[PDB]
Amino acid sequence: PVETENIARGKQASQSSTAYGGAATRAVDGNVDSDYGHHSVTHTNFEDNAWWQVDLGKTENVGKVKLYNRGDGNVANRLSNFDVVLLNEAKQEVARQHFDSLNGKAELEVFFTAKDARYVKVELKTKNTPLSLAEVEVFRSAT
């Protein structure tokens, strides 16, 4: 049971690198449109262990992180073999979940057990592959 407010929206975002103009802030712009050509999907270099991060700006009790995959050009499978990580204000890991695949689905819902975190990170574990996210949404645990 989570709150409805997407607390990642408009927050400071960063990523390992930026390519094809795929600014990290596109994942927190309030637009889940997954077509790259519509300018709301991020893109890093083709590199090893690409990552993307949002800073929630303070410590929040997180219950759910929802990822929206890229949908055009059939390169959806680049979001595979990845971690979703929650960090504290000191940037130490407080939670981590591993996923093989989204299995063709446009989105993934990730449920955390009432974790107090300031940062949310997506980390690819794969070589020479870019990280592209249409959107990352984060919701507080319902109190």
Ligand X SMILES: C[C@@H]1O[C@H](O)[C@@H](O)[C@H](O)[C@@H]1O
Minimum gap (Å) between residue 3 Cβ and Ca ion: 20
CB closer to Ca ion out of 66 and 115: 66
Stretch 45-84 residues interacting with ligand X (CB under 6 A): 73, 75
Question: Mask 17-36, x = binds ligand X (CB under 6 A)?
Answer: ---x---------------x
Helix, strand, coil percent values for the chain (each to nearest 5): 10, 45, 45
Asked if 38 contacts 68 with a C-beta cutoff of 8 angstroms, the reply is no
d(CA 112, CA 114) in angstroms, rounded, equals 6
Closest alpha carbon to 84 in 133, 26, 28: 133
Nearer to ligand X, 29 or 60 (CB): 29
Q: Counting contacts by CB under 6 A, is residue 111 touching ligand X?
A: no
* Minimum CB distance to ligand X, residue 52 (Å): 15
